[PDB]
A and B are shown apart, each in its own frame.
Chain A
């Protein structure tokens, strides 16, 4: 599942790649940037194997600059991308939206959606669905957008959802995330809505864990962080680069008993995750 990053020059693809992936199917592989300038596309210039090897195509649109020509070039790209392979998920990111109001952001997203839909109607493409995400480097939005893009390329999503739901239901967990060690891209969660504040807490917990481990090296990552109100934050490294982060509430119980039952349940969950080849 190799995703391809496409966009105009100075839209922010390299900065996005650096911020996300520098700080296979599921691991954060070396993605491919592609500077696409305005030109006439050559018909079948040995690009069929390239687009057939892309799990999902990601397009970047700069909201600061004019984007009508960007949407036109995007439509030209989709015009052969959907023709070569009709199973490619197409994603569009509206980057650099940090200095915009909520109403302006929603209006811009609606205008971009309407323009893309009308241009695809003009080109005669049918049965194609394009997702849109409002992304920015300075906040959590790019992480959530890449999380959705990665989640669209894991065929075992619902089974992981059921497994995490059962784990949370039998361990008094508030919210459990199945992160990855790099890029902080959470892979699976429960049916509960992804709270932004809790996601940022878990991401900074991942950063603190990795940094503190890297400070003392050269002699399986586990971490328990308990707050003042009894709320604990748990960490346990899963198979390959996956890591499990959960927020467990005590509900007026013993701390050590809760830690023991959570450790046993999470070890059982890891043993179950060993059978499924969701890693790497």
Chain B
């Protein structure tokens, strides 16, 4: 493992999420998958330690020229709030070289309040290759479509961040969709269950209000 100093930068300099100094620790080539774990042995949950995957990219010319330590720079916004670390802290770096073996199995997505075609989903998934994502990251397609990565799965574990490869089964769940209900009105609707409730009474008192409350939540 390696050691690096954490840094933050605004969107004016660079648009990438995580940037590291390529001139320091030159074991890492420009195109790699690099862990950003903040723990060196004995991981702590109460203290707060996370393993955030990302893809290596070099510093901006303006930032590298007018530099002030900070071997690794994280773009502000959502990733900084997820990591929750001060402006100068101690982090660690690995060089996991198995991109194929570290592919996430299922990456979720949300397409709320916008119509994506099936081919649009295919194109958006094609653009999301060799790029690492994390939970609740607002991806953008055509500068108007908004996404939300609500779940990354790998070997039965819901990892906070994962790597999306060629063989990643990325799904596109819809948070704003057309729904059709087909209620059967039969002779059994006025029948009574063993507790003492009619089935249509259940339908109008416990299924629909709960599903509307859940949909609103």
Direct contact of A and B (CB under 8 A): yes
Which residues from B are CB-within-8-Å of A193? 8-10, 76
**Distance between A232 CB and nearest chain B CB, rounded to angstroms:** 14
| CB contact between B86 and one of A103, A165, A168, A174 (< 8 Å): that residue | A174
Which residues from A are CB-within-8-Å of B63? 191
Q: A87 at the A/B interface (Cβ < 8 Å)?
A: no
Which residues from A are CB-within-8-Å of B9? 191-193
Q: Known: A103-B146, A193-B10. Contact between A165 and B66, CB under 8 A?
A: yes
**Distance between A53 CB and nearest chain B CB, rounded to angstroms:** 31
**Distance between A196 CB and nearest chain B CB, rounded to angstroms:** 10
Q: A223 at the A/B interface (Cβ < 8 Å)?
A: no
Contact in complex: B87, A174 (CB < 8 Å): yes
Contact in complex: B146, A191 (CB < 8 Å): no
Q: A64 at the A/B interface (Cβ < 8 Å)?
A: no
**Distance between B109 CB and nearest chain A CB, rounded to angstroms:** 16
Minimum CB distance partner of A192 in chain B: B8
Those of B140-171 within 8 Å (CB) of chain A: 144, 146
Q: A175 at the A/B interface (Cβ < 8 Å)?
A: yes
Q: A169 at the A/B interface (Cβ < 8 Å)?
A: yes
Which residues from A are CB-within-8-Å of B76? 193, 195
Which residues from A are CB-within-8-Å of B86? 174, 249
**Distance between B91 CB and nearest chain A CB, rounded to angstroms:** 16
Which residues from B are CB-within-8-Å of A169? 68
Q: Known: A103-B113, A165-B68, A169-B68. Contact between A174 and B10, CB under 8 A?
A: no
Contact in complex: B88, A174 (CB < 8 Å): yes
| Interface mask (A191-211 → B, CB under 8 Å = 1, otherwise 0) | 111010000000000000000
Bound complex: CA of A6 vs CA of B203, how far in Å? 56
Those of A140-186 within 8 Å (CB) of chain B: 165, 168-169, 174-175
Those of A98-119 within 8 Å (CB) of chain B: 103, 110
**Distance between B139 CB and nearest chain A CB, rounded to angstroms:** 14
Bound complex: CA of A192 vs CA of B66, how far in Å? 12
Q: How many A-B residue pairs have CB under 8 A?
A: 29
**Distance between A261 CB and nearest chain B CB, rounded to angstroms:** 17
Bound complex: CA of A174 vs CA of B87, how far in Å? 7
Bound complex: CA of A110 vs CA of B142, how far in Å? 14
| CB contact between B88 and one of A103, A191, A195, A249 (< 8 Å): that residue | A249
| Interface mask (B110-124 → A, CB under 8 Å = 1, otherwise 0) | 001100000000000
Which residues from A are CB-within-8-Å of B13? 191
Bound complex: CA of A193 vs CA of B8, how far in Å? 7
**Distance between B60 CB and nearest chain A CB, rounded to angstroms:** 11
Which residues from A are CB-within-8-Å of B146? 103
Q: Known: A103-B113, A103-B146. Contact between A191 and B87, CB under 8 A?
A: no
**Distance between A159 CB and nearest chain B CB, rounded to angstroms:** 13
Those of B79-127 within 8 Å (CB) of chain A: 86-88, 112-113
Which residues from B are CB-within-8-Å of A165? 66, 68
**Distance between A164 CB and nearest chain B CB, rounded to angstroms:** 12
Bound complex: CA of A249 vs CA of B86, how far in Å? 10
Q: Known: A103-B146, A174-B88, A249-B88. Contact between A191 and B10, CB under 8 A?
A: yes
Those of B8-57 within 8 Å (CB) of chain A: 8-10, 13
**Distance between A247 CB and nearest chain B CB, rounded to angstroms:** 9
Which residues from A are CB-within-8-Å of B112? 103
Bound complex: CA of A195 vs CA of B8, how far in Å? 11
| CB contact between A175 and one of B10, B66, B87, B144 (< 8 Å): that residue | B87
Contact in complex: A192, B113 (CB < 8 Å): no
Which residues from B are CB-within-8-Å of A110? 144
Bound complex: CA of A134 vs CA of B9, how far in Å? 22
Which residues from A are CB-within-8-Å of B113? 103
**Distance between A255 CB and nearest chain B CB, rounded to angstroms:** 18
Q: Can you spell out 14 A-B residue pairs with CB atoms less than 8 angstroms apart? A: A165-B66, A168-B68, A174-B86, A174-B87, A174-B88, A191-B10, A191-B63, A192-B8, A192-B9, A192-B87, A193-B10, A193-B76, A195-B76, A249-B88
List 5 other contacts, CB 8 Å, given A165-B66, A174-B87.
A103-B113, A168-B68, A191-B13, A193-B10, A249-B88
